[PDB]
Short mmCIF file of C-alpha atoms and ligand atoms in Angstrom, two decimals:
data_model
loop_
_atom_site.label_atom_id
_atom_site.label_comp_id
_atom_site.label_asym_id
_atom_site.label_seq_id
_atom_site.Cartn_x
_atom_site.Cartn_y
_atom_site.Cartn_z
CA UNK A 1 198.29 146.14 102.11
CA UNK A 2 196.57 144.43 104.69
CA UNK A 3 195.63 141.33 102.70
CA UNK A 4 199.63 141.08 101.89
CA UNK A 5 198.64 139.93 97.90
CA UNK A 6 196.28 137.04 98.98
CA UNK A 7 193.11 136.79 97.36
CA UNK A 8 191.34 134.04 95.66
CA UNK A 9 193.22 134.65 92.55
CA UNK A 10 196.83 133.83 94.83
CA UNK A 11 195.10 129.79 95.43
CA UNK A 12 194.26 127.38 92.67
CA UNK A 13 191.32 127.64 90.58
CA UNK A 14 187.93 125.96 92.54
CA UNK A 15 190.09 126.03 96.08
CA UNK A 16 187.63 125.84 98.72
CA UNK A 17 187.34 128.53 101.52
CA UNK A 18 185.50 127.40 104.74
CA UNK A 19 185.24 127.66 108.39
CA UNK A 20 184.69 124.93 110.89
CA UNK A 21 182.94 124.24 114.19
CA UNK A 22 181.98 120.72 116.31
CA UNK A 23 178.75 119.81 117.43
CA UNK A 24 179.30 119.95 120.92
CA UNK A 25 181.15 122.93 121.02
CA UNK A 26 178.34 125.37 119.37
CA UNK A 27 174.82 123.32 119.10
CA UNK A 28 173.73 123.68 122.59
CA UNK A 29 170.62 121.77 122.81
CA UNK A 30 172.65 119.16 124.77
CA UNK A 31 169.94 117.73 126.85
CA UNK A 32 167.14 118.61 124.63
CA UNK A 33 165.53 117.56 121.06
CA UNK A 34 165.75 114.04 122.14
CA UNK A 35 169.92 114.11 122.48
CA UNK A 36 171.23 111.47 124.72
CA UNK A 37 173.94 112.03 126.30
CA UNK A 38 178.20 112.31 124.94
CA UNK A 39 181.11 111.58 127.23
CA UNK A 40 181.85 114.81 127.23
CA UNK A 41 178.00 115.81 128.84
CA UNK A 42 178.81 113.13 131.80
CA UNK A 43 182.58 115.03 131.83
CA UNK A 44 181.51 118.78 131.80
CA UNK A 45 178.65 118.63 133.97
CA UNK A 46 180.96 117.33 137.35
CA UNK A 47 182.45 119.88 138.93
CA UNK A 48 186.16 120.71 138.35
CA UNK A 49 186.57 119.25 135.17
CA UNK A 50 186.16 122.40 132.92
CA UNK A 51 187.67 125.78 133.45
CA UNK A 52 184.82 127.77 136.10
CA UNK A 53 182.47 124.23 135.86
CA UNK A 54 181.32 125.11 132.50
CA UNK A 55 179.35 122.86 130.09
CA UNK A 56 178.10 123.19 126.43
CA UNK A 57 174.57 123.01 127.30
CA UNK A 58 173.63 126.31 125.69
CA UNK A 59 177.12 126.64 124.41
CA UNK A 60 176.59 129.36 121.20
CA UNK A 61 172.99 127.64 120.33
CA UNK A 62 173.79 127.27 116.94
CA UNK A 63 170.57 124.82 117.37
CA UNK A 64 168.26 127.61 117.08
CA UNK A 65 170.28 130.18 115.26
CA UNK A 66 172.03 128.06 112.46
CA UNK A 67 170.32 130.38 109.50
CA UNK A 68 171.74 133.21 111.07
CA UNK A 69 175.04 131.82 111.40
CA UNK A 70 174.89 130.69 107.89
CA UNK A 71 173.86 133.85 106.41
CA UNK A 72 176.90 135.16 108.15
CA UNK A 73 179.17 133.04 106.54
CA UNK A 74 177.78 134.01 103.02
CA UNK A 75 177.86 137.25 104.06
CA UNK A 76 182.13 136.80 104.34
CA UNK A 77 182.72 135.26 101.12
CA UNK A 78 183.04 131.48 102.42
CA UNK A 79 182.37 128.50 99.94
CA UNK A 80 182.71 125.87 102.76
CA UNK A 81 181.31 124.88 105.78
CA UNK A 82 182.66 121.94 108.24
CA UNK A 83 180.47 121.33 110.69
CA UNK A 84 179.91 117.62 112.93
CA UNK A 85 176.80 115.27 113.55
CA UNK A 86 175.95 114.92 117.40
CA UNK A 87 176.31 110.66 117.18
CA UNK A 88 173.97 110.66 120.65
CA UNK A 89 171.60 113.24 118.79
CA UNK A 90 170.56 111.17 116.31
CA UNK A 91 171.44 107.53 118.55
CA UNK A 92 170.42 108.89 122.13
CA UNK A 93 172.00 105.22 123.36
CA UNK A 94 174.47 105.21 120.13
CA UNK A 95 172.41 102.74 118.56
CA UNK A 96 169.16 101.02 117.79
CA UNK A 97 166.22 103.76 118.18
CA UNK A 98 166.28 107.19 115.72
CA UNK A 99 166.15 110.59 117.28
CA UNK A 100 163.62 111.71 114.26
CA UNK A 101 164.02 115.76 115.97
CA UNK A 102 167.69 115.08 115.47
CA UNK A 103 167.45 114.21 112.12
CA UNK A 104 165.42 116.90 111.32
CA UNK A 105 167.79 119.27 112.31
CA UNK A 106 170.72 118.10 110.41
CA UNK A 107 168.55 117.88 107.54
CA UNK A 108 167.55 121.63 108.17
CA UNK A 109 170.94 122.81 108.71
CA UNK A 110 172.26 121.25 105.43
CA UNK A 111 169.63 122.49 103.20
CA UNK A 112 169.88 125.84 104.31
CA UNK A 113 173.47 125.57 103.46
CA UNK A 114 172.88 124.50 100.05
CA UNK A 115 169.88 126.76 99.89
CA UNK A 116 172.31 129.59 100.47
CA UNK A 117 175.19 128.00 98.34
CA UNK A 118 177.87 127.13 100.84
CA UNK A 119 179.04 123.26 100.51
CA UNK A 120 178.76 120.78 103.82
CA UNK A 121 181.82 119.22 105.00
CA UNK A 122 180.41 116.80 107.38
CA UNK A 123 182.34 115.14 110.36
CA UNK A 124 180.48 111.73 111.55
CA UNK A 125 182.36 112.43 114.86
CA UNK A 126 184.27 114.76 117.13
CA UNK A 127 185.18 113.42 120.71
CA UNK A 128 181.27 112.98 121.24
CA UNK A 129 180.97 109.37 122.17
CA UNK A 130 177.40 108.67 123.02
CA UNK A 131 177.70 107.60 126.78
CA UNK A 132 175.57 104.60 126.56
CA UNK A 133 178.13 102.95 124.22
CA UNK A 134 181.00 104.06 126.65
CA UNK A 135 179.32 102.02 129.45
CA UNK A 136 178.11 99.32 127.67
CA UNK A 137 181.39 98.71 125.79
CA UNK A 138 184.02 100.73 126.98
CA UNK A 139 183.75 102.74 124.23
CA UNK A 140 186.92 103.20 122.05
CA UNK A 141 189.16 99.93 123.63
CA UNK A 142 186.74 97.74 122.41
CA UNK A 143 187.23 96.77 119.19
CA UNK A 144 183.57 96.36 118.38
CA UNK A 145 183.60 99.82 117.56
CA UNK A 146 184.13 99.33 114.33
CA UNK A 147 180.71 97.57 113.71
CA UNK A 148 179.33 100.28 115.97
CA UNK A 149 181.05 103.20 114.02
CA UNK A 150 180.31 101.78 110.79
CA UNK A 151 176.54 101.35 112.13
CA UNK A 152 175.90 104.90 112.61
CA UNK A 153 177.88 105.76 109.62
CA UNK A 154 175.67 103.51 107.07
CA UNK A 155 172.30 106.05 108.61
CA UNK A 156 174.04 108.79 108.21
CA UNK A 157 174.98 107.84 104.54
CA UNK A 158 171.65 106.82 103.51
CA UNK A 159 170.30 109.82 105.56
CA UNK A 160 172.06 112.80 104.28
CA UNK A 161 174.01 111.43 101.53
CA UNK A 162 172.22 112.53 98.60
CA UNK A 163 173.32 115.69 99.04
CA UNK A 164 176.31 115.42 101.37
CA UNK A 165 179.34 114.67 99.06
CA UNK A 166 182.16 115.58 101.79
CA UNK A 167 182.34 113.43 104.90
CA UNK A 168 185.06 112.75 107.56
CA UNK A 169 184.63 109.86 109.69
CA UNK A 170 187.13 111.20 112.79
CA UNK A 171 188.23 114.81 114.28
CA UNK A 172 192.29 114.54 115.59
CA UNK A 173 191.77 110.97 116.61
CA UNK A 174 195.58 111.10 118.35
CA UNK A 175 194.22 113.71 120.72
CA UNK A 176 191.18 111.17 121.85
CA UNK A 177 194.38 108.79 122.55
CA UNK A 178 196.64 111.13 124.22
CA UNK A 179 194.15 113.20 126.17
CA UNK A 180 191.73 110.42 127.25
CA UNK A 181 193.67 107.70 128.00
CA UNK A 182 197.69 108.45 128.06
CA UNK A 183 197.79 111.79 129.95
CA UNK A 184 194.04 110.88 131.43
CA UNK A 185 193.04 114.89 130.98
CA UNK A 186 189.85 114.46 129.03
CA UNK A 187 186.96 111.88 129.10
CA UNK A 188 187.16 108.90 129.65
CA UNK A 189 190.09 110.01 132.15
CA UNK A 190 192.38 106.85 131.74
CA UNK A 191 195.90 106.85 132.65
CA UNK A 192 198.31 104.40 134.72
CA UNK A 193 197.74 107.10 137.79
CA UNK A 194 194.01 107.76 137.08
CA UNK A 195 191.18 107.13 139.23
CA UNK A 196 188.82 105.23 136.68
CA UNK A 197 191.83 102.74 135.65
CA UNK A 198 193.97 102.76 132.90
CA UNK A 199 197.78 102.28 131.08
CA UNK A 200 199.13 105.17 129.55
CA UNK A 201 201.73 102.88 128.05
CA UNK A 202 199.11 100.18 126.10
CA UNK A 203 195.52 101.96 126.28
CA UNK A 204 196.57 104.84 123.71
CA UNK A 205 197.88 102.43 121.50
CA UNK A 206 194.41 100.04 120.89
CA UNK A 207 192.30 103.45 121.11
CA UNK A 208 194.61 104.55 118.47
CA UNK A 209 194.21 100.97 116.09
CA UNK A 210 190.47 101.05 116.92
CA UNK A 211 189.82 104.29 115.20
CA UNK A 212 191.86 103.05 112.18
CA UNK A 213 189.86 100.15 111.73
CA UNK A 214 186.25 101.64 112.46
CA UNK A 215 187.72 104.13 110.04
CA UNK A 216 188.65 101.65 107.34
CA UNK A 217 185.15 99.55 108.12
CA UNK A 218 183.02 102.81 107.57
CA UNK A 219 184.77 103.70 104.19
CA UNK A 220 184.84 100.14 103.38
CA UNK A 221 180.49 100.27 103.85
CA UNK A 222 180.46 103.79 101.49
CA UNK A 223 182.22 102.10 98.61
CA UNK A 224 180.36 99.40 98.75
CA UNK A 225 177.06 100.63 99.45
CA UNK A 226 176.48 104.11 98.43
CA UNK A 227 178.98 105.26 96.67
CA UNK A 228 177.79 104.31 93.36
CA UNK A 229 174.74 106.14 94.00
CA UNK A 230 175.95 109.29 95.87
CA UNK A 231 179.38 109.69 94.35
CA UNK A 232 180.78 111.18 97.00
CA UNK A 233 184.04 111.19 98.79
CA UNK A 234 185.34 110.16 103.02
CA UNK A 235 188.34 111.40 104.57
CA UNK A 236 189.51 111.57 108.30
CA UNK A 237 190.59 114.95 109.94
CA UNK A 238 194.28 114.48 111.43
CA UNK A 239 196.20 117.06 113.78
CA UNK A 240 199.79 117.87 112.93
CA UNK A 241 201.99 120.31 114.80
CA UNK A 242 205.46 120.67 113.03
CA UNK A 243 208.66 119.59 114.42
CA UNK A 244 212.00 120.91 113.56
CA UNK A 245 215.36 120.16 114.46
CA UNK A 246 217.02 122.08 116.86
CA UNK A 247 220.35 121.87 115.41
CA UNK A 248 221.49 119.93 112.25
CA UNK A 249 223.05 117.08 114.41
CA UNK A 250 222.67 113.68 113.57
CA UNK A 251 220.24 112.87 116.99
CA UNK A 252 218.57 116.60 117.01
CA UNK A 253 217.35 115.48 112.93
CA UNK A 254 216.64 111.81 114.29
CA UNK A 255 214.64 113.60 117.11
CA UNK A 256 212.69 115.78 114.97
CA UNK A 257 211.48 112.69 112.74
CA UNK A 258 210.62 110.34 115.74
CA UNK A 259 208.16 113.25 116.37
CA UNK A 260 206.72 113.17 113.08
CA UNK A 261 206.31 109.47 112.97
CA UNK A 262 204.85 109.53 116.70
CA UNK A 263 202.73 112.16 115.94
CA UNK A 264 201.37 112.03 112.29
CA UNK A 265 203.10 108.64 111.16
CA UNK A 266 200.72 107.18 113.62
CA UNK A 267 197.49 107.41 111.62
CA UNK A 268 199.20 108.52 107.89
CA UNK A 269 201.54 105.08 107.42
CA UNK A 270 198.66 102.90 107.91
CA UNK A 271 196.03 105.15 106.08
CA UNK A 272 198.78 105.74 103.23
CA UNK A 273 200.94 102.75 103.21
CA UNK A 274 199.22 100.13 105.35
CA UNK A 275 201.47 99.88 108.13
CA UNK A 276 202.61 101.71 111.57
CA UNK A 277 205.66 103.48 110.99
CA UNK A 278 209.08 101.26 111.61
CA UNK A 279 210.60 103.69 114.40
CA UNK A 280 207.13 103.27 116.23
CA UNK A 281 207.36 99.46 115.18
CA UNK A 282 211.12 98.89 116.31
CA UNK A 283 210.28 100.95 120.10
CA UNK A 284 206.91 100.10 120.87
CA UNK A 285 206.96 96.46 119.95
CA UNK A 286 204.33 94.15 121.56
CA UNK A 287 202.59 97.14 122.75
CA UNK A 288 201.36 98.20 119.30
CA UNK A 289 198.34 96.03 117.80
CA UNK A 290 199.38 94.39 114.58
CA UNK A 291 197.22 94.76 111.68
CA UNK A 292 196.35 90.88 109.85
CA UNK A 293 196.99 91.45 106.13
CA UNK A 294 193.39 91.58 105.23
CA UNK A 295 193.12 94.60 107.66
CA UNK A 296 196.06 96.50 106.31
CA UNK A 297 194.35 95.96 103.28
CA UNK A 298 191.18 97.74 104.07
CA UNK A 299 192.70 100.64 106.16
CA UNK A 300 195.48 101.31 103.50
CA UNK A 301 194.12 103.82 100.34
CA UNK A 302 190.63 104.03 102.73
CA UNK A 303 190.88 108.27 102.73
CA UNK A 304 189.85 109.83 99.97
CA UNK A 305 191.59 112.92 101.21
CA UNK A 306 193.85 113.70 104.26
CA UNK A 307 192.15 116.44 106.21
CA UNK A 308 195.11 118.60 108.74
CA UNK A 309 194.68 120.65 111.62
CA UNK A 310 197.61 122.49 111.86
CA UNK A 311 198.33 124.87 114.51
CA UNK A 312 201.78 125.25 115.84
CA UNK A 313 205.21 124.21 115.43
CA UNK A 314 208.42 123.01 118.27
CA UNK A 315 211.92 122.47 118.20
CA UNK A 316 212.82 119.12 118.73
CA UNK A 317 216.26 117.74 120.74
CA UNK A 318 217.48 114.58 120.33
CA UNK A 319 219.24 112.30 123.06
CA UNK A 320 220.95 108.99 122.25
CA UNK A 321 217.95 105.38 121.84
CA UNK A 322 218.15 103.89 125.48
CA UNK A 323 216.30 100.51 126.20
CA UNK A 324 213.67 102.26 128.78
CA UNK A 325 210.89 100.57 131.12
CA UNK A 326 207.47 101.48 129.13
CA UNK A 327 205.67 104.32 130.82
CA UNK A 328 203.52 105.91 128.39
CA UNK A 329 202.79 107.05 124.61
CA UNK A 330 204.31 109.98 125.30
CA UNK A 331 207.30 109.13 126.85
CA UNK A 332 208.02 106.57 123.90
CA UNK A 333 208.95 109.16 121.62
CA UNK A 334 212.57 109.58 123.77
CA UNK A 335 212.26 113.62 122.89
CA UNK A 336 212.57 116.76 124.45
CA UNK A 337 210.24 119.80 123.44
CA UNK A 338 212.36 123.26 123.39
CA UNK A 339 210.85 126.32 122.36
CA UNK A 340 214.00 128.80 121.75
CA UNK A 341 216.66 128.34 119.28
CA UNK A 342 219.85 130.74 119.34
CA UNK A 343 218.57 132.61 122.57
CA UNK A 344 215.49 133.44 120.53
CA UNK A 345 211.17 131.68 121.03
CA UNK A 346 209.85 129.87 118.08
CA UNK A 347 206.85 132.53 118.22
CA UNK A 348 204.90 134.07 120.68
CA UNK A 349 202.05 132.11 122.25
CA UNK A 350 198.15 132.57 121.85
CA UNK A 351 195.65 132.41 124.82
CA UNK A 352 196.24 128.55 124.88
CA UNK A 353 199.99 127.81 126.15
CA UNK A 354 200.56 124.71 123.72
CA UNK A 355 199.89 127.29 120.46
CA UNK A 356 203.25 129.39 119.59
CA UNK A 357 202.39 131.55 116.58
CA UNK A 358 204.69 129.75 113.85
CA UNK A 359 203.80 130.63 109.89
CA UNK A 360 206.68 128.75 109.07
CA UNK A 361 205.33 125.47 110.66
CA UNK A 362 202.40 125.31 108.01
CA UNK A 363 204.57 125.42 105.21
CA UNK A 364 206.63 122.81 107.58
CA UNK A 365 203.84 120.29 107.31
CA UNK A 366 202.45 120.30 104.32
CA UNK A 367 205.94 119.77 102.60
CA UNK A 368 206.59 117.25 104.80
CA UNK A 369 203.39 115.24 103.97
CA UNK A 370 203.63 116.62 100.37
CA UNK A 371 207.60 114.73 100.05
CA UNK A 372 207.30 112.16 102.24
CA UNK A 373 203.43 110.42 101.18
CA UNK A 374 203.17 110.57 97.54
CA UNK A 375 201.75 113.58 97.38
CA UNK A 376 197.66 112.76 98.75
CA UNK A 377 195.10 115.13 98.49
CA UNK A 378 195.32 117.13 101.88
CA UNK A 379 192.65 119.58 103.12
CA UNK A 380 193.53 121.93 105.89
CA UNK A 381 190.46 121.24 108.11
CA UNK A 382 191.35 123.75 110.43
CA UNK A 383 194.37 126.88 111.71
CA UNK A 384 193.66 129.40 113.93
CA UNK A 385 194.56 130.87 117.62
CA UNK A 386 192.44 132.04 120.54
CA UNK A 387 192.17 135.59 122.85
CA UNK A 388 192.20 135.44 126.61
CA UNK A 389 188.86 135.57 128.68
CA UNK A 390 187.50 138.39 130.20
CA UNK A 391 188.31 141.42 127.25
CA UNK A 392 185.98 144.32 126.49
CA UNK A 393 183.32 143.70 123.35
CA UNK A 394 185.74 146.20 121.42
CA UNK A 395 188.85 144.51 122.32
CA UNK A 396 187.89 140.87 121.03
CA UNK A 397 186.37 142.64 117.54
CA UNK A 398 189.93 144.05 116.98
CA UNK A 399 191.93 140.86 116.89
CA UNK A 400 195.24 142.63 114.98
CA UNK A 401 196.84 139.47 116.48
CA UNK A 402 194.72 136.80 114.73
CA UNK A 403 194.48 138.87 111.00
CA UNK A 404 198.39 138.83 111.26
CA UNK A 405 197.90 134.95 111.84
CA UNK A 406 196.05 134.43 109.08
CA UNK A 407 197.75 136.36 106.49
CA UNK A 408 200.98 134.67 107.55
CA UNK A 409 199.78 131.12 108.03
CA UNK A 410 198.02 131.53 104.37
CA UNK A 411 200.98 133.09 103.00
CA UNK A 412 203.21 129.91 104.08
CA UNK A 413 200.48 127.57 102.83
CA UNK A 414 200.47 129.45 98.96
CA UNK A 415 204.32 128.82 99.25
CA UNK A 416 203.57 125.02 99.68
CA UNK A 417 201.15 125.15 96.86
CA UNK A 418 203.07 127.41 94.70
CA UNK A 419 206.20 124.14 95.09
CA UNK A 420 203.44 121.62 93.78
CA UNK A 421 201.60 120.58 97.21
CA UNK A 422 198.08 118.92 96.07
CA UNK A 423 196.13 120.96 98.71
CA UNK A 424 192.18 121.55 97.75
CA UNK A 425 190.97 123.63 100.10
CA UNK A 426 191.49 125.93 103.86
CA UNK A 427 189.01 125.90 106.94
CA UNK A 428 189.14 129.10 109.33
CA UNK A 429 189.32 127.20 113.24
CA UNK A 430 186.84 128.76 113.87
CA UNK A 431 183.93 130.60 112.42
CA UNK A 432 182.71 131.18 116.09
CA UNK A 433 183.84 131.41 119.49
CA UNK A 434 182.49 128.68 121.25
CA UNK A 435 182.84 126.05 123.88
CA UNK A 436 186.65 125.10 124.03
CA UNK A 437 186.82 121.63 126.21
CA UNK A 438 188.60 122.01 129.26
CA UNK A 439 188.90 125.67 128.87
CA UNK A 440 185.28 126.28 128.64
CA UNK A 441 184.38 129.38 127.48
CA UNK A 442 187.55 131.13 129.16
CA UNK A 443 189.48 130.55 125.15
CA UNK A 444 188.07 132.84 122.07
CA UNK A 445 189.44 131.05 118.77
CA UNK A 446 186.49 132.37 116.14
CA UNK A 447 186.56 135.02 113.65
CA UNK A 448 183.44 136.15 114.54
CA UNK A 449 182.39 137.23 118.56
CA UNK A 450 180.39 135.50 120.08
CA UNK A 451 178.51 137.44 123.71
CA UNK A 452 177.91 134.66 126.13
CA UNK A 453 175.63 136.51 128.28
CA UNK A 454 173.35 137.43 125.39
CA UNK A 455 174.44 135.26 122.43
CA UNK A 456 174.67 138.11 119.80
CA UNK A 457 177.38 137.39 117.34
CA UNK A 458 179.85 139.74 116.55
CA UNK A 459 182.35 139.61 113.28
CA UNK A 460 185.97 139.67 114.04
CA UNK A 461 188.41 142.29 112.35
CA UNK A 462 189.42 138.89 111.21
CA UNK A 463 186.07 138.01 109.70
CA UNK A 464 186.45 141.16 107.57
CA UNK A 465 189.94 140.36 106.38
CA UNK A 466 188.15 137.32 105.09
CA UNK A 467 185.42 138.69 103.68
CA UNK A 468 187.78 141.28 102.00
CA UNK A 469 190.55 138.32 100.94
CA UNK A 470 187.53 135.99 99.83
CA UNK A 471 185.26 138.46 97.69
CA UNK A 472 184.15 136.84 94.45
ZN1 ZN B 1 167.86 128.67 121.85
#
C-alpha cells in the first residue's frame, strides 16, 4: 500500500506532524510593510549571486496569502507549523525602533494558526541578519551579538509569547559558518580568497562560538524572565547529514566520527555537555574560542529540545592524523567524502547535487544522537528533496520520487523510535516551493506547487500521501 503501514497510529501517542518554511524564502514583502533590509536582500539583489539574478522579493507572498496557506495545511492533516520571524521586519536597523506593520503580521499569522488549530513552531532567526547590524558590527564575528540576539529575542518573547510555546533561537547555524565565511558562497562572502576579507581557517570558528553564546544568552533571558509566566519551551534547529564508514578499518571508523564531531559535535557537545568536542579540541587548538566556566555553564542544558534537519547521508574514508598548515574548517576534518561503496552510489541524487536519497541515514542520525547524548528530546525540524526547474504543472504535481522519500525516510525514523529514540515530533522541508538561496527559484523542495508566474498553489502527490498518512 502506498502509505507502506505508516499512519499516525505507527508514531507515539501526541507526535507532532508539521511542515516548515523561512521567512525570507516565502513572505515576500521584502522591501515593503516597513521591512528593513537582511543580508541576504543586499546579497540577492546584485547580479550573479543567485541562480538567473533572482531575489525573494515576491518570493511565494505568503505575506498576503498566509490564511490560504494555512487552510491548506489543515486541509492535509498537519498539527504543526514551523515558520521564522523576519528580525529586520520587526527591527528595520535590527534594533531600537518597532516595525508596528511587522508586528501585526506575525500576530495575524499566529492567530490564524491557532484559530484554525495548527500549533506555531517559531524560529527567532534563519540566515536573515538585518543589514544594519552587519555594517555596524560585523554582524556574527562580533561577539556583541549576543546582547543583540538576546535583545530582539526578549520583544519577541513578551510580544508573541503568550501564545507561542515553541521557539528556536537559530536555523543550521554550521551552514551560516561554512557557507558565509569558510567556503565564502553565501552572505557575508568571507573566505581567505574572498573579495570582502576573511579566514576560512579562524572566521568559521568565532561565527560558530558566537551563535552558541547569543544562543545560551537568549535562553538564559526566557528562564529568567518569561518563562514562569508563559511556560513555554526554546530549542535551536541543527543540520546533520550522516556519515558512515566506508569500510570497518580502524582510520575509515575514525574518519566517519571526526565527521560527526566536525559536523554535529560542533554545536551538540557544548549545548549537551558544555564543551567542544576533544578531536575538534586536540586539531583545531588555538583556533577554537574557549568557553570561561561561567559560559559553559550557561550554554550547557540551554535547549530544551534538539531540533535536526536531516537530509542525506556519505561514506566517509579515513587517512592517517598529519600535522597540516591550517587552511580552513573544512579542511580540518582530514576526510575524504566518497559516495559508492562496493562499486555501488549511496542513493541517487535529488535536484540539489549535495542531497543523495539515503533512508538509512535518518535512522543513522538519530541513533547516533539517541546513543551517544543521553538520549535529549530531538525534533526533526525538517527532511525532504527538491525537483529540477523548468517541468510541466503536471509533472511537478506527480512527485513519485519525493512520496517514495517520505515513506522511506519515515519508515527509518519509526525504526529509531520503535529502539527507544525520544523523538516528539516530524516537519515536512517544505510545505511550499519557494525561494531556495543560491538556487533561486530554479530548486522545487515543497509538497505542495507553487506557479511562480501566477502564484496559485498546487498540492503535491506528496501532499496527498500526507493528508492520507496524517488523517485523524
Ligand atoms: Zn501580494
Amino acid at each position: 500500500n502506498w502509505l507502506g503501514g505508516l499512519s499516525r497510529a505507527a508514531f507515539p501517542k501526541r507526535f507532532v506532524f508539521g511542515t516548515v518554511t523561512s521567512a525570507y524564502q516565502v513572505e515576500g514583502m521584502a522591501a515593503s510593510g516597513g521591512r528593513g533590509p537582511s543580508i541576504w536582500d543586499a546579497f540577492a539583489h546584485t547580479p550573479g549571486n543567485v541562480a538567473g539574478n533572482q531575489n525573494g522579493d515576491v518570493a511565494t507572498d505568503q505575506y498576503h496569502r498566509y490564511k490560504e496557506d494555512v487552510n491548506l495545511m489543515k486541509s492535509l492533516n498537519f498539527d504543526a507549523y514551523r515558520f521564522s520571524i523576519s528580525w529586520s521586519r520587526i527591527f528595520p536597523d535590527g534594533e531600537g525602533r518597532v516595525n508596528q506593520e511587522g508586528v501585526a503580521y506575525y500576530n495575524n499569522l499566529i492567530n490564524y494558526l491557532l484559530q484554525k488549530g495548527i500549533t506555531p513552531y517559531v524560529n527567532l532567526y534563519h540566515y536573515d541578519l538585518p543589514l544594519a547590524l552587519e555594517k555596524k558590527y560585523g554582524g556574527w564575528l562580533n561577539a556583541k551579538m549576543a546582547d543583540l540576539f538576546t535583545e530582539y529575542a526578549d520583544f519577541c518573547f513578551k510580544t508573541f509569547g503568550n501564545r507561542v510555546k515553541h521557539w528556536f533561537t537559530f536555523n543550521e547555524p554550521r551552514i551560516v559558518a561554512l557557507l558565509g565565511y569558510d567556503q565564502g558562497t553565501n552572505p557575508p562572502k568571507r573566505c581567505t580568497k574572498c573579495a570582502a576579507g576573511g579566514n576560512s581557517a579562524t572566521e568559521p570558528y568565532i561565527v560558530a562560538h558566537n551563535f552558541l553564546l547569543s544562543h545560551a544568552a537568549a535562553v538564559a533571558r526566557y528562564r529568567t524572565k518569561y518563562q514562569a509566566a508563559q511556560q513555554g519551551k526554546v530549542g535551536i534547529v541543527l543540520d546533520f547529514n550522516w556519515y558512515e564508514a566506508l569500510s570497518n578499518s580502524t582510520e575509515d571508523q575514525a574518519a566517519a566520527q571526526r565527521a560527526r564531531d566536525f559536523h554535529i559535535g560542533w554545536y551538540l557537545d557544548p549545548l549537551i555537555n558544555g564543551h567542544y568536542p576533544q578531536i575538534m579540541q586536540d586539531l583545531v587548538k588555538d583556533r577554537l574560542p574557549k568557553f570561561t566556566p561561567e559560559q559553559a555553564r550557561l550554554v550547557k542544558g540551554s535547549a530544551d529540545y534538539i531540533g535536526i534537519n536531516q537530509y542525506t547521508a556519505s561514506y566517509m574514508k579515513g587517512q592517517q592524523l598529519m600535522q597540516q598548515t591550517p587552511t580552513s574548517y573544512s579542511a580540518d576534518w582530514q576526510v575524504t567524502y566518497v559516495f559508492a561503496k562496493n562499486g555501488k552510489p549511496i542513493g541517487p541524487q535529488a535536484n540539489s547535487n549535495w542531497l543523495y536519497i539515503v533512508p538509512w541515514g535518518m535512522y543513522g542520525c538519530v541513533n547516533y544522537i539517541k546513543q551517544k547524548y543521553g538520549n535529549p528530546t530531538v525534533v526533526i525540524t525538517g527532511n525532504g528533496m527538491d525537483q529540477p526547474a523548468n517541468l510541466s504543472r503536471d509533472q511537478y504535481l506527480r512527485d513519485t520520487t519525493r512520496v517514495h522519500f517520505y515513506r522511506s525516510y519515515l519508515t527509518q525514523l519509526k525504526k529509531a523510535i520503535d529502539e527507544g529514540a525520544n523523538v516528539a515530533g516530524y516537519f515536512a522541508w517544505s510545505l511550499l516551493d519557494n525561494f531556495e538561496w543560491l538556487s533561486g527559484y530554479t530548486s522545487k523542495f515543497g509538497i505542495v506547487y507553487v506557479d511562480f508566474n501566477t502564484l496559485e498553489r498546487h498540492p503535491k502527490a506528496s501532499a496527498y500521501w500526507f493528508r492520507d498518512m496524517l488523517k485523524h
